[PDB]
Amino acid sequence: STLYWKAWPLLLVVAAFNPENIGLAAWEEYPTLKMLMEMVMTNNYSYPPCTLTDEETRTEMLNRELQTAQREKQEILAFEGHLAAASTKQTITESSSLLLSQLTSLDPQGPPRRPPPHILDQVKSLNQSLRLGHLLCRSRNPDFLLHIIQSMPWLADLVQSSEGSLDVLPVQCLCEFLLHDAAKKRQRQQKQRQLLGRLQDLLLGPKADEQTTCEVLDYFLRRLGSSQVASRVLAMKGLSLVLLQGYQWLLRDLPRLPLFDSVRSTTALALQQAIHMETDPQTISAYLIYLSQHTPVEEQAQHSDLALDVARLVVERSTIMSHLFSKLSPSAASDAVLSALLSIFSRYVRRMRQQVFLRWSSGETATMHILVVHAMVILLTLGPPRADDSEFQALLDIWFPEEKPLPTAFLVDTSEEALLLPDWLKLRMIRSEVLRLVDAALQDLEPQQLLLFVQSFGIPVSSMSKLLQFLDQAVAHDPQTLEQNIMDKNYMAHLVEVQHERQTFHSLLTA
Amino acid sequence: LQFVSPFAFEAMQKVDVVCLASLSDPELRLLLPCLVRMALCAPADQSQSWAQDKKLILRLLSGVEAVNSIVALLSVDFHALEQDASKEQQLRHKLQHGLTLEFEHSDSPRRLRLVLSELLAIMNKVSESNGEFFFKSSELFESPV
């Protein structure tokens, strides 16, 4: 074990100084050494390597190492038992195994092994003394830094220690160092200004070719999908630097790119991916505005994917939606966002009428997603926008045509009719101020559902009045089942009395 | 940010239901958990005056969507969570999504488990800090939204 562990640093330094052949061989054939120089470039000597951010892969690596260690323990015990039988005729056990702490499996190219803490300490000492990370930064070929790039925390120290690596021919590295940048400080500022001019030429300038522009933009796009908010902030900051007043770079400058159409599909795809994980309401609003103004509607698949993604945003991120549409502060930006969403969904509905199979009372047929249906329902409950109401009324009539049956729904797989209106959505419609939606929700409500809805708060006054009327009707129809469902008569009676100043059913409860 | 108004705090201390009505909406939004717990939990004191106070609390309760969410939070059983937390604490003594995203997407009991684990980890860190002040970062607690 001692020799096996002490062999690694020598090979590591040899590879660091001859990365063309020995370094590549270690990088490819020997996983143990392959992570070792990664440790030094990242300056983070953590097993599993900080480069691999995937939790399940980390756990898989841990379990593989544990299994290999257990198998090695068993094999060492068996071999030492053989040796003891041959020489000393002694039984070898866990506490009586001398070779257990002295020998290790000689499988350098096999499953990775845990570096000893002292091994890691001497690796870090060697790296600090010999600026080994900076050696590979000088080494253009093979620059495994870009391979790893294909992360900001370990990039910080590496870049700061590698001053001569500020440019590094690859444009991906140029953008990476620009984001990193986002006497010595003055020199860094001047160099960053020069790099900004170079990238401005590479994107807006005559030399701006599709390949380099796509690389530059896609780097920021992919890093905007990082769960860490810091990475997304850096990416957006760099994009704005190269290019809702604060998002005008995306809203106004980005459309002005010479290859804007060339990169528009990729940008829309990246924004669609990032919306599912974004947190800032204003950034989400900017994403929505840009998608509404620039999403390619030509592709049926693209249109369906955008609609489904926006539906996921509406449903799964109801908290962010509430932040955006806070009734306290109805803003022009919020109204514009609502208008953009309504226009997007109206266009999608037009395409569908021109997963669940939906048939309209008019006879139109199309298979959309119930989540998207609920998304239109939620937007309708949000109320008409202050600027435009044509789209709002059109969608309202399409989904809830006046004095007409609602569009029938069926399961795509089984053709069985499905509940287009879940109980929670019906409750939200009840809370909404739209009379048509309120009536649609009120239609076909069980006594238990009525009780649960009454239990909710924030509902409009006329809505509680209608709920009281419906509960009185239910009492008239079948008071026995309603009373059976009633748990605390006094509780519901007090709630009803509260609603009164906020009748027959109240009398029933009192009975 | 907005802190609890001193008037709101003194009203809560004096259990002045009438002043609770005078309190503005954001103060109520901040104070919801105690208020809803008061209105829903079985009353320790069963006086008629307290019953009328409860009626006033109910009068004030309307206008909040988070009431339903808090009711769901309370719905979760707590004995199982407590025993799980005790076992996890003993172990400590011996997710692809960010924590904020997990808190959002996951349901109420998952939110409880996550936050409880985080707070107990912070508690253990403080206990072992030996009086040395440090900082701990959690996107959940650093998320303004």
Side-chain angles (χ1 to χ4, degrees), chain A residues 132-165:
Chain A
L132 298 174
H134 188 42
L135 273 169
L136 301 186
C137 286
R138 259 80 63 84
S139 178
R140 296 291 185 269
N141 165 47
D143 49 350
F144 299 113
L145 162 64
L146 188 59
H147 178 281
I148 293 186
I149 286 159
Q150 299 147 0
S151 65
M152 180 37 89
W154 69 262
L155 184 77
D157 56 14
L158 175 67
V159 168
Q160 282 169 54
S161 55
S162 303
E163 159 54 32
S165 65

mmCIF file of all heavy atoms in Angstrom, chain A residues 132-165:
data_model
loop_
_atom_site.group_PDB
_atom_site.id
_atom_site.type_symbol
_atom_site.label_atom_id
_atom_site.label_comp_id
_atom_site.label_asym_id
_atom_site.label_seq_id
_atom_site.Cartn_x
_atom_site.Cartn_y
_atom_site.Cartn_z
ATOM 1 N N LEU A 132 1.886 23.484 -10.346
ATOM 2 C CA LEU A 132 1.637 22.458 -11.353
ATOM 3 C C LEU A 132 0.418 22.789 -12.201
ATOM 4 O O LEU A 132 0.414 22.528 -13.409
ATOM 5 C CB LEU A 132 1.462 21.098 -10.678
ATOM 6 C CG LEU A 132 2.676 20.595 -9.893
ATOM 7 C CD1 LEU A 132 2.342 19.314 -9.146
ATOM 8 C CD2 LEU A 132 3.870 20.385 -10.813
ATOM 9 N N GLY A 133 -0.626 23.355 -11.594
ATOM 10 C CA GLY A 133 -1.786 23.748 -12.374
ATOM 11 C C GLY A 133 -1.430 24.724 -13.478
ATOM 12 O O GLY A 133 -1.930 24.619 -14.600
ATOM 13 N N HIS A 134 -0.551 25.681 -13.178
ATOM 14 C CA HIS A 134 -0.136 26.655 -14.177
ATOM 15 C C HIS A 134 0.676 26.017 -15.297
ATOM 16 O O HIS A 134 0.691 26.543 -16.416
ATOM 17 C CB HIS A 134 0.662 27.769 -13.500
ATOM 18 C CG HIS A 134 0.982 28.922 -14.399
ATOM 19 N ND1 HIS A 134 0.066 29.454 -15.281
ATOM 20 C CD2 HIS A 134 2.104 29.667 -14.530
ATOM 21 C CE1 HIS A 134 0.616 30.464 -15.930
ATOM 22 N NE2 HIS A 134 1.854 30.614 -15.493
ATOM 23 N N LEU A 135 1.343 24.892 -15.028
ATOM 24 C CA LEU A 135 2.088 24.206 -16.080
ATOM 25 C C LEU A 135 1.162 23.765 -17.205
ATOM 26 O O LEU A 135 1.419 24.038 -18.384
ATOM 27 C CB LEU A 135 2.830 23.004 -15.496
ATOM 28 C CG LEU A 135 4.216 23.273 -14.909
ATOM 29 C CD1 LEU A 135 4.704 22.059 -14.132
ATOM 30 C CD2 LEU A 135 5.209 23.644 -16.001
ATOM 31 N N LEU A 136 0.067 23.085 -16.862
ATOM 32 C CA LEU A 136 -0.881 22.669 -17.886
ATOM 33 C C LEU A 136 -1.617 23.855 -18.495
ATOM 34 O O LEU A 136 -2.049 23.772 -19.649
ATOM 35 C CB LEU A 136 -1.878 21.668 -17.304
ATOM 36 C CG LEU A 136 -1.258 20.391 -16.725
ATOM 37 C CD1 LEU A 136 -2.343 19.413 -16.305
ATOM 38 C CD2 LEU A 136 -0.304 19.740 -17.719
ATOM 39 N N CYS A 137 -1.767 24.952 -17.749
ATOM 40 C CA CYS A 137 -2.317 26.168 -18.339
ATOM 41 C C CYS A 137 -1.414 26.682 -19.451
ATOM 42 O O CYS A 137 -1.894 27.081 -20.520
ATOM 43 C CB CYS A 137 -2.506 27.233 -17.262
ATOM 44 S SG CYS A 137 -3.899 26.925 -16.153
ATOM 45 N N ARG A 138 -0.089 26.647 -19.239
ATOM 46 C CA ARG A 138 0.896 27.020 -20.299
ATOM 47 C C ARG A 138 0.765 25.992 -21.430
ATOM 48 O O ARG A 138 0.862 26.396 -22.610
ATOM 49 C CB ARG A 138 2.362 27.037 -19.817
ATOM 50 C CG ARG A 138 2.930 28.424 -19.503
ATOM 51 C CD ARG A 138 2.491 28.941 -18.129
ATOM 52 N NE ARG A 138 2.996 28.071 -17.052
ATOM 53 C CZ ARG A 138 4.219 28.134 -16.483
ATOM 54 N NH1 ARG A 138 5.105 29.051 -16.871
ATOM 55 N NH2 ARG A 138 4.541 27.272 -15.514
ATOM 56 N N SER A 139 0.601 24.703 -21.098
ATOM 57 C CA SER A 139 0.533 23.643 -22.102
ATOM 58 C C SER A 139 -0.736 23.819 -22.925
ATOM 59 O O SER A 139 -1.845 23.570 -22.446
ATOM 60 C CB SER A 139 0.565 22.274 -21.432
ATOM 61 O OG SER A 139 0.464 21.236 -22.391
ATOM 62 N N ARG A 140 -0.576 24.256 -24.176
ATOM 63 C CA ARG A 140 -1.728 24.408 -25.057
ATOM 64 C C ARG A 140 -2.271 23.055 -25.494
ATOM 65 O O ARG A 140 -3.491 22.851 -25.530
ATOM 66 C CB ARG A 140 -1.346 25.247 -26.277
ATOM 67 C CG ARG A 140 -0.947 26.674 -25.949
ATOM 68 C CD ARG A 140 -2.136 27.491 -25.472
ATOM 69 N NE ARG A 140 -1.787 28.891 -25.262
ATOM 70 C CZ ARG A 140 -1.354 29.398 -24.115
ATOM 71 N NH1 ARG A 140 -1.192 28.642 -23.040
ATOM 72 N NH2 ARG A 140 -1.073 30.695 -24.045
ATOM 73 N N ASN A 141 -1.385 22.121 -25.829
ATOM 74 C CA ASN A 141 -1.775 20.790 -26.283
ATOM 75 C C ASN A 141 -1.058 19.761 -25.421
ATOM 76 O O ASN A 141 0.190 19.730 -25.411
ATOM 77 C CB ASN A 141 -1.433 20.592 -27.760
ATOM 78 C CG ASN A 141 -1.481 19.137 -28.178
ATOM 79 O OD1 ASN A 141 -2.434 18.423 -27.869
ATOM 80 N ND2 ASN A 141 -0.446 18.688 -28.878
ATOM 81 N N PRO A 142 -1.777 18.897 -24.683
ATOM 82 C CA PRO A 142 -3.232 18.796 -24.529
ATOM 83 C C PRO A 142 -3.752 19.615 -23.353
ATOM 84 O O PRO A 142 -3.427 19.309 -22.205
ATOM 85 C CB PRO A 142 -3.446 17.302 -24.291
ATOM 86 C CG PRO A 142 -2.180 16.838 -23.622
ATOM 87 C CD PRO A 142 -1.089 17.847 -23.914
ATOM 88 N N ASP A 143 -4.552 20.641 -23.635
ATOM 89 C CA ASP A 143 -5.117 21.492 -22.587
ATOM 90 C C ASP A 143 -6.385 20.821 -22.078
ATOM 91 O O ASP A 143 -7.485 21.045 -22.588
ATOM 92 C CB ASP A 143 -5.392 22.897 -23.109
ATOM 93 C CG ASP A 143 -6.163 22.897 -24.415
ATOM 94 O OD1 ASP A 143 -6.318 21.813 -25.014
ATOM 95 O OD2 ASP A 143 -6.613 23.981 -24.841
ATOM 96 N N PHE A 144 -6.229 19.984 -21.051
ATOM 97 C CA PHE A 144 -7.373 19.302 -20.460
ATOM 98 C C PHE A 144 -8.293 20.250 -19.704
ATOM 99 O O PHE A 144 -9.389 19.836 -19.310
ATOM 100 C CB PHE A 144 -6.895 18.189 -19.527
ATOM 101 C CG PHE A 144 -6.095 17.123 -20.219
ATOM 102 C CD1 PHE A 144 -4.751 16.951 -19.935
ATOM 103 C CD2 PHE A 144 -6.689 16.289 -21.153
ATOM 104 C CE1 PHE A 144 -4.013 15.970 -20.572
ATOM 105 C CE2 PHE A 144 -5.957 15.306 -21.791
ATOM 106 C CZ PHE A 144 -4.618 15.146 -21.500
ATOM 107 N N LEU A 145 -7.880 21.499 -19.486
ATOM 108 C CA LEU A 145 -8.775 22.466 -18.858
ATOM 109 C C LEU A 145 -10.022 22.674 -19.707
ATOM 110 O O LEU A 145 -11.146 22.676 -19.194
ATOM 111 C CB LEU A 145 -8.038 23.789 -18.636
ATOM 112 C CG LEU A 145 -8.893 25.037 -18.397
ATOM 113 C CD1 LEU A 145 -9.682 24.906 -17.104
ATOM 114 C CD2 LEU A 145 -8.017 26.279 -18.364
ATOM 115 N N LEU A 146 -9.843 22.834 -21.019
ATOM 116 C CA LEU A 146 -10.995 22.970 -21.901
ATOM 117 C C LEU A 146 -11.799 21.679 -21.969
ATOM 118 O O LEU A 146 -13.030 21.722 -22.083
ATOM 119 C CB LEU A 146 -10.540 23.391 -23.298
ATOM 120 C CG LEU A 146 -11.662 23.760 -24.268
ATOM 121 C CD1 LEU A 146 -12.497 24.904 -23.718
ATOM 122 C CD2 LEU A 146 -11.089 24.120 -25.629
ATOM 123 N N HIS A 147 -11.128 20.527 -21.901
ATOM 124 C CA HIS A 147 -11.847 19.259 -21.858
ATOM 125 C C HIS A 147 -12.767 19.198 -20.646
ATOM 126 O O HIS A 147 -13.927 18.783 -20.754
ATOM 127 C CB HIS A 147 -10.851 18.101 -21.836
ATOM 128 C CG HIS A 147 -11.495 16.752 -21.752
ATOM 129 N ND1 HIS A 147 -11.968 16.227 -20.569
ATOM 130 C CD2 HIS A 147 -11.742 15.820 -22.702
ATOM 131 C CE1 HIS A 147 -12.481 15.030 -20.795
ATOM 132 N NE2 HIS A 147 -12.356 14.760 -22.082
ATOM 133 N N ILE A 148 -12.265 19.611 -19.482
ATOM 134 C CA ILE A 148 -13.099 19.659 -18.285
ATOM 135 C C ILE A 148 -14.217 20.678 -18.462
ATOM 136 O O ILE A 148 -15.358 20.448 -18.044
ATOM 137 C CB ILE A 148 -12.237 19.971 -17.048
ATOM 138 C CG1 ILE A 148 -11.289 18.800 -16.767
ATOM 139 C CG2 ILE A 148 -13.128 20.271 -15.839
ATOM 140 C CD1 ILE A 148 -10.483 18.936 -15.490
ATOM 141 N N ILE A 149 -13.907 21.821 -19.076
ATOM 142 C CA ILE A 149 -14.924 22.841 -19.308
ATOM 143 C C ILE A 149 -16.079 22.261 -20.115
ATOM 144 O O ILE A 149 -17.252 22.518 -19.822
ATOM 145 C CB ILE A 149 -14.302 24.061 -20.012
ATOM 146 C CG1 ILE A 149 -13.460 24.870 -19.024
ATOM 147 C CG2 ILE A 149 -15.387 24.938 -20.621
ATOM 148 C CD1 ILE A 149 -12.424 25.757 -19.685
ATOM 149 N N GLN A 150 -15.766 21.472 -21.137
ATOM 150 C CA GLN A 150 -16.792 20.847 -21.959
ATOM 151 C C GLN A 150 -17.625 19.877 -21.129
ATOM 152 O O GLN A 150 -17.108 18.885 -20.612
ATOM 153 C CB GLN A 150 -16.161 20.115 -23.145
ATOM 154 C CG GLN A 150 -15.382 21.020 -24.087
ATOM 155 C CD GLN A 150 -14.182 20.331 -24.710
ATOM 156 O OE1 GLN A 150 -13.912 19.160 -24.441
ATOM 157 N NE2 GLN A 150 -13.455 21.056 -25.551
ATOM 158 N N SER A 151 -18.447 25.026 -11.785
ATOM 159 C CA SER A 151 -17.037 24.896 -12.133
ATOM 160 C C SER A 151 -16.289 26.203 -11.887
ATOM 161 O O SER A 151 -15.064 26.216 -11.764
ATOM 162 C CB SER A 151 -16.888 24.470 -13.595
ATOM 163 O OG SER A 151 -17.375 25.473 -14.469
ATOM 164 N N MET A 152 -17.039 27.302 -11.819
ATOM 165 C CA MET A 152 -16.432 28.603 -11.547
ATOM 166 C C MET A 152 -15.615 28.610 -10.262
ATOM 167 O O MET A 152 -14.538 29.231 -10.244
ATOM 168 C CB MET A 152 -17.527 29.675 -11.506
ATOM 169 C CG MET A 152 -17.028 31.091 -11.234
ATOM 170 S SD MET A 152 -15.446 31.484 -12.005
ATOM 171 C CE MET A 152 -15.988 32.093 -13.600
ATOM 172 N N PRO A 153 -16.057 27.988 -9.163
ATOM 173 C CA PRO A 153 -15.264 28.070 -7.924
ATOM 174 C C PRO A 153 -13.832 27.592 -8.085
ATOM 175 O O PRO A 153 -12.903 28.296 -7.667
ATOM 176 C CB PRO A 153 -16.056 27.188 -6.949
ATOM 177 C CG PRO A 153 -17.447 27.198 -7.476
ATOM 178 C CD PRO A 153 -17.308 27.235 -8.963
ATOM 179 N N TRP A 154 -13.617 26.419 -8.681
ATOM 180 C CA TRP A 154 -12.259 25.937 -8.897
ATOM 181 C C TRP A 154 -11.578 26.626 -10.070
ATOM 182 O O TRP A 154 -10.348 26.577 -10.170
ATOM 183 C CB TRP A 154 -12.257 24.421 -9.115
ATOM 184 C CG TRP A 154 -12.874 23.980 -10.408
ATOM 185 C CD1 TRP A 154 -14.146 23.525 -10.594
ATOM 186 C CD2 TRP A 154 -12.240 23.936 -11.693
ATOM 187 N NE1 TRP A 154 -14.347 23.206 -11.915
ATOM 188 C CE2 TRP A 154 -13.192 23.450 -12.612
ATOM 189 C CE3 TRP A 154 -10.962 24.263 -12.157
ATOM 190 C CZ2 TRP A 154 -12.907 23.284 -13.964
ATOM 191 C CZ3 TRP A 154 -10.681 24.099 -13.500
ATOM 192 C CH2 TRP A 154 -11.648 23.613 -14.389
ATOM 193 N N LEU A 155 -12.346 27.255 -10.961
ATOM 194 C CA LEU A 155 -11.747 28.073 -12.007
ATOM 195 C C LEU A 155 -11.129 29.340 -11.438
ATOM 196 O O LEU A 155 -10.138 29.840 -11.979
ATOM 197 C CB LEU A 155 -12.795 28.435 -13.056
ATOM 198 C CG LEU A 155 -12.266 29.223 -14.256
ATOM 199 C CD1 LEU A 155 -11.532 28.311 -15.226
ATOM 200 C CD2 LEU A 155 -13.400 29.957 -14.945
ATOM 201 N N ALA A 156 -11.709 29.883 -10.367
ATOM 202 C CA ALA A 156 -11.239 31.154 -9.827
ATOM 203 C C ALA A 156 -9.749 31.099 -9.512
ATOM 204 O O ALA A 156 -8.946 31.843 -10.090
ATOM 205 C CB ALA A 156 -12.043 31.516 -8.577
ATOM 206 N N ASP A 157 -9.365 30.217 -8.588
ATOM 207 C CA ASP A 157 -7.972 30.131 -8.167
ATOM 208 C C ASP A 157 -7.060 29.702 -9.308
ATOM 209 O O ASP A 157 -5.943 30.214 -9.427
ATOM 210 C CB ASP A 157 -7.852 29.166 -6.988
ATOM 211 C CG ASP A 157 -8.408 27.792 -7.301
ATOM 212 O OD1 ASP A 157 -8.636 27.492 -8.491
ATOM 213 O OD2 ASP A 157 -8.646 27.022 -6.350
ATOM 214 N N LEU A 158 -7.506 28.764 -10.145
ATOM 215 C CA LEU A 158 -6.672 28.315 -11.254
ATOM 216 C C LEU A 158 -6.340 29.473 -12.188
ATOM 217 O O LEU A 158 -5.173 29.697 -12.531
ATOM 218 C CB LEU A 158 -7.383 27.192 -12.012
ATOM 219 C CG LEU A 158 -6.703 26.689 -13.286
ATOM 220 C CD1 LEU A 158 -5.396 25.990 -12.951
ATOM 221 C CD2 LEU A 158 -7.631 25.756 -14.046
ATOM 222 N N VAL A 159 -7.356 30.234 -12.595
ATOM 223 C CA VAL A 159 -7.124 31.370 -13.479
ATOM 224 C C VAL A 159 -6.257 32.414 -12.790
ATOM 225 O O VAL A 159 -5.326 32.961 -13.394
ATOM 226 C CB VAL A 159 -8.466 31.967 -13.934
ATOM 227 C CG1 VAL A 159 -8.248 33.318 -14.601
ATOM 228 C CG2 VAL A 159 -9.186 31.003 -14.863
ATOM 229 N N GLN A 160 -6.543 32.709 -11.519
ATOM 230 C CA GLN A 160 -5.775 33.733 -10.821
ATOM 231 C C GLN A 160 -4.307 33.346 -10.710
ATOM 232 O O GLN A 160 -3.429 34.210 -10.808
ATOM 233 C CB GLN A 160 -6.374 33.980 -9.438
ATOM 234 C CG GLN A 160 -7.623 34.846 -9.466
ATOM 235 C CD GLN A 160 -8.359 34.860 -8.141
ATOM 236 O OE1 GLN A 160 -7.779 35.165 -7.100
ATOM 237 N NE2 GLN A 160 -9.644 34.529 -8.175
ATOM 238 N N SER A 161 -4.019 32.062 -10.511
ATOM 239 C CA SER A 161 -2.652 31.567 -10.486
ATOM 240 C C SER A 161 -2.032 31.499 -11.874
ATOM 241 O O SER A 161 -0.802 31.526 -11.989
ATOM 242 C CB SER A 161 -2.608 30.177 -9.841
ATOM 243 O OG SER A 161 -3.492 29.282 -10.494
ATOM 244 N N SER A 162 -2.848 31.410 -12.925
ATOM 245 C CA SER A 162 -2.361 31.358 -14.304
ATOM 246 C C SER A 162 -2.638 32.707 -14.963
ATOM 247 O O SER A 162 -3.685 32.904 -15.585
ATOM 248 C CB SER A 162 -3.014 30.209 -15.064
ATOM 249 O OG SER A 162 -2.790 28.975 -14.404
ATOM 250 N N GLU A 163 -1.689 33.636 -14.820
ATOM 251 C CA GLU A 163 -1.824 34.938 -15.466
ATOM 252 C C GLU A 163 -1.571 34.835 -16.964
ATOM 253 O O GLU A 163 -2.247 35.497 -17.760
ATOM 254 C CB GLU A 163 -0.863 35.938 -14.822
ATOM 255 C CG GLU A 163 -0.533 37.152 -15.684
ATOM 256 C CD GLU A 163 -1.772 37.885 -16.156
ATOM 257 O OE1 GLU A 163 -2.778 37.891 -15.417
ATOM 258 O OE2 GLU A 163 -1.737 38.456 -17.266
ATOM 259 N N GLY A 164 -0.606 34.014 -17.367
ATOM 260 C CA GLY A 164 -0.304 33.830 -18.769
ATOM 261 C C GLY A 164 -1.365 33.098 -19.552
ATOM 262 O O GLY A 164 -1.274 33.015 -20.779
ATOM 263 N N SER A 165 -2.375 32.560 -18.873
ATOM 264 C CA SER A 165 -3.473 31.855 -19.514
ATOM 265 C C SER A 165 -4.681 32.748 -19.756
ATOM 266 O O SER A 165 -5.782 32.233 -19.976
ATOM 267 C CB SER A 165 -3.885 30.651 -18.665
ATOM 268 O OG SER A 165 -4.417 31.067 -17.420
#
